[PDB]
Swiss-Prot record, chain A:
Keyword Ribosomal protein: yes
Keyword flag Cell cycle: no
Organism: Mycolicibacterium smegmatis (strain ATCC 700084 / mc(2)155)
Name of this protein: Small ribosomal subunit protein bS16
Keywords: Ribonucleoprotein, Ribosomal protein
Family membership: Belongs to the bacterial ribosomal protein bS16 family.
GO cellular component: cytoplasm; small ribosomal subunit
Whole-protein coverage range: 2 to 114 of 156
Swiss-Prot record, chain C:
Protein name, UniProt field: Small ribosomal subunit protein bS20
Entry keyword annotation includes 4Fe-4S: no
InterPro entries cross-referenced by the UniProt entry: Ribosomal_bS20, Ribosomal_bS20_sf
Gene Ontology molecular functions: small ribosomal subunit rRNA binding; structural constituent of ribosome
GO terms for biological process, alphabetical: translation
One of the Pfam families matching this protein, by short name: Ribosomal_S20p
UniProt organism field: Mycolicibacterium smegmatis (strain ATCC 700084 / mc(2)155) (Mycobacterium smegmatis)
Curated annotation (Swiss-Prot), chain D:
Lineage: Bacteria, Bacillati, Actinomycetota, Actinomycetes, Mycobacteriales
This protein's record includes keyword Ribosomal protein: yes
Placement of covalent cross-link Isoglutamyl lysine isopeptide (Lys-Gln) (interchain with Q-Cter in protein Pup): 93
Gene Ontology terms for molecular function: rRNA binding; structural constituent of ribosome
One GO biological process term: translation
Protein's UniProt name: Small ribosomal subunit protein uS17
PANTHER family: 40S RIBOSOMAL PROTEIN S11 FAMILY MEMBER, SMALL RIBOSOMAL SUBUNIT PROTEIN US17M
Known role: One of the primary rRNA binding proteins, it binds specifically to the 5'-end of 16S ribosomal RNA.
Family, as annotated: Belongs to the universal ribosomal protein uS17 family.
Any Pfam family hit: Ribosomal_S17
PROSITE patterns named in the record: RIBOSOMAL_S17 (PS00056)
Length: 113, 200, 85, 94
RNA sequence: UUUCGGGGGUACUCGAGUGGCGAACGGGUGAGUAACACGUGGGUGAUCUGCCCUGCACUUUGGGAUAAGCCUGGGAAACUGGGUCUAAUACCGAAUACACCCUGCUGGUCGCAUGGCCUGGUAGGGGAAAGCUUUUGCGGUGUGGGAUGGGCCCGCGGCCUAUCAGCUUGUUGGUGGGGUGAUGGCCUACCAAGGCGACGACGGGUAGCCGGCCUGAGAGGGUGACCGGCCACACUGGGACUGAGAUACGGCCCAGACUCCUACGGGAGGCAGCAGUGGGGAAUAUUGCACAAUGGGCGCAAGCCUGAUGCAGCGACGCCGC
């Protein structure tokens, strides 16, 4: 069975994953049919990106997600869109963007005078 | 590691003063040791090596780190000389010293290594830290009343602050506008000799 | 020999081999009889021997003893041989 | 409301089998001719254009091709050992 | 329930057993291999594909056993014989299917020649299935189509040696058979006498191949450690079986070498898995922790298994930083 797995990357302490499509018989770090997202749990809101169209296609042909990938698919709403039960609502908690360095620089300059 | 032995030795050997206000170098401007007066043979390699030693003993950077800097500077799309000089000038300890907060580069490095500073709101104790555009370097509150910073903040009449930096607060904040260009660096020696040496 | 599933599989593979051997031997016997009947040169005995053998062939294909392509090849050969005679 | 009981397969465009033009150098086997093909690549190091020769075995049923005829071939599945080409037609006789 | 020896039931649960799935993945090594092994690009009108997804049609009917259990025999052991007895989604007979397979006739159409397609039409014959469970319920059979994983064939590309010039007789081709998932001297009978080679056949030596790595201004030279893909092998040499799939590492059979047990009749074993030991050597580590994360197998699920993996220990061995 073709499956939607998570392959591990990054260094020792920091696991960063790629949401790949691969046969169940291949090893974890083996060749991948497709890369359709990434998942970084080390971040505080744990960045998640999933290519919705490719995910829909691969679920349509019958690829089986693993449990973590199923959880991610439920989070992004792709799983529900594939099934159709509640609708496809984006529960994705995106990371809050950081203020620019220039903003803080000008703020410090203004605070000085 | 770090160079720890006497400082004027290097200045006497290299024929120029690197600290800036050293009376021992003025008293004897010739190389140290028994044969510090013997006439020397002239060779391009000697001059290039002496220039490199001047550069890497002014800033207190060891040879491997200096070679890494040179490779980085050559890789960049500018020209090698000023690129290397700007990479050297962007080190945190050099920024601290050039901001007038340290009389000598050695004590600037000592202060940085002891975690007396705080860059962009996060404690940084790494002299080789490179400083980008729009960085705010602050002294942590615990060390504001210390003797070194006390005497640093009431003798702000020494060497002028370069253009690319600006001490802006009564608490001696440091603001970095842009990485220095060759015109504003105001450093001894000649970068072209170093470029020649490392191309050998 | 070292792992329980291996020993159980030894026994089960043996029993499967016995069954497959029986089915294959029966198919071979039927085909051989049909070939002899064709060699004799009569049509009717060849005809319903071909029918019985073809039924045996595809019904052994259903059991998984032989691949369906093999059964199809054998049936085609037997029918063509009968037609030639 | 019921789906179709037959689902036609999605059509796949046919592939392009390789073709060649050569000269007959042997017709001593039945239904088989030997064709010589020429290839002109460039030397990977010195850059000069090099002309190289190769022999293939083709299949013609009636054997209308004599020795010295310029012929046309198209690849095919292995018809025997070493036989992988099919004669299309005789481009010119000689 | 009891004399405290225990006795019955339950089916929560579960040793052993039958049955299914897995065990062909994952992990190791580089001996062999100068080859369609590998890299790159094609072809398959010459082909298979369990589990998975999705249409359609079914899921009818009957039967004979056997493991386990109990009784008993043989042997030192390994293990093994007999009697009786019992169940199934185990095994077997039949009906139905006309979507499928085979054959005869026949229409149209596309070609790239055999041929392919229109589930073309038509006549004859034929091919299956299994139930369990009250709970988010799981399954069985045929068949259409996807997806995945392959098989086979071919162009081109990457070593050294004529102080290795002839090599080949299933060898080159055809026909009819056989065989295979499939084409094919793959095998076979007969027929013909071809095929390859200085554009280096046939021999000899060496070698896993590649993405890459090091060096260099570049071209080029050297190399294939880690990581990633493919290949080959699993004490040595053969062989098939089961299966959707087999170089079957922790399967089987035989032969051999070696190690071990023996009542001398006979039996057992395979670290190039993870640690570890001896030896060789200039030289290379812990008989560690956990399934917490990721991947995998089984299970409806809870769950179980995983020396894969995630970590830790040792060694300035390397890079980087202080």
């Amino acid at each position: 069975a073709v499956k939607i797995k998570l392959t591990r990357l990054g260094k020792i302490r920091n696991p960063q994953y790629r949401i790949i499509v691969a046969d169940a018989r291949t090893r974890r770090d083996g060749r991948a049919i497709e890369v359709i997202g990434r998942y970084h749990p080390k971040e505080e809101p744990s960045l998640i990106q999933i290519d919705s169209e490719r995910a829909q296609y691969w679920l349509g042909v019958g690829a089986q997600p693993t449990e973590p990938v199923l959880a991610l698919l439920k989070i992004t709403g792709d799983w529900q869109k594939f099934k159709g039960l509640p609708g496809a609502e984006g529960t994705l908690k995106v990371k809050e963007p950081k203020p620019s360095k220039l903003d803080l620089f000008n703020a410090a300059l203004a605070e000085a005078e | 590691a770090r160079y720890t032995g006497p400082a004027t030795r290097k200045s006497r050997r290299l024929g120029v003063d690197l600290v800036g206000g050293d009376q021992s170098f003025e008293k004897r401007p010739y190389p140290p040791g028994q044969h510090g007066r013997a006439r020397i043979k002239e060779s391009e390699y000697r001059q290039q090596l002496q220039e490199k030693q001047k550069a890497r003993f002014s800033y207190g950077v060891m040879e491997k780190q200096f070679r890494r800097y040179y490779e980085e500077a050559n890789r960049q799309p500018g020209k090698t000389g000023d690129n290397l000089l700007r990479i050297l000038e962007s080190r945190l300890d050099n920024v601290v010293y050039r901001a007038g907060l340290a009389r000598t580069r050695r004590m600037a490095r000592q202060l940085v290594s002891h975690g007396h500073f705080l860059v962009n709101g996060v404690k940084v104790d790494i002299p080789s830290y490179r400083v980008s555009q729009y960085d705010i370097i602050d002294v942590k509150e615990k060390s504001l009343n210390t003797l070194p910073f006390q005497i640093a903040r009431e003798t702000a009449g020494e060497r002028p602050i370069p253009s690319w930096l600006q001490v802006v607060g009564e608490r001696q904040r440091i603001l970095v506008h842009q990485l220095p260009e060759r015109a504003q660096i105001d450093v001894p020696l000649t970068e072209q000799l170093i470029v020649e040496l490392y191309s050998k | 020999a070292n792992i329980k599933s291996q020993i159980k599989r030894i026994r089960t593979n043996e029993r499967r081999r016995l069954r497959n051997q029986s089915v294959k031997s029966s198919l071979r016997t039927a085909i051989r009889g049909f070939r002899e009947a064709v060699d004799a040169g009569d049509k009717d005995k060849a005809s319903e021997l071909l029918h019985a053998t073809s039924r045996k062939l595809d019904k052994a294909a259903s059991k998984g003893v032989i691949h369906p392509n093999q059964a199809a090849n054998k049936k085609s050969a037997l029918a063509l041989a009968l037609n030639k005679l | 409301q019921k789906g179709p009981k037959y689902t036609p397969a999605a059509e796949k465009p046919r592939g392009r089998r390789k073709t060649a033009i050569g000269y007959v150098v042997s017709d001593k086997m039945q239904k088989t001719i030997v064709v010589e093909l020429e290839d002109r690549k460039s030397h990977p190091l010195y850059g000069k254009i090099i002309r190289t020769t190769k022999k293939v075995k083709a299949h013609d049923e009636n054997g209308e091709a004599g020795i010295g005829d310029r012929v046309s071939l198209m690849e095919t599945r292995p018809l025997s050992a070493t036989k992988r080409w099919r004669l299309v037609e005789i481009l010119e006789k000689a």
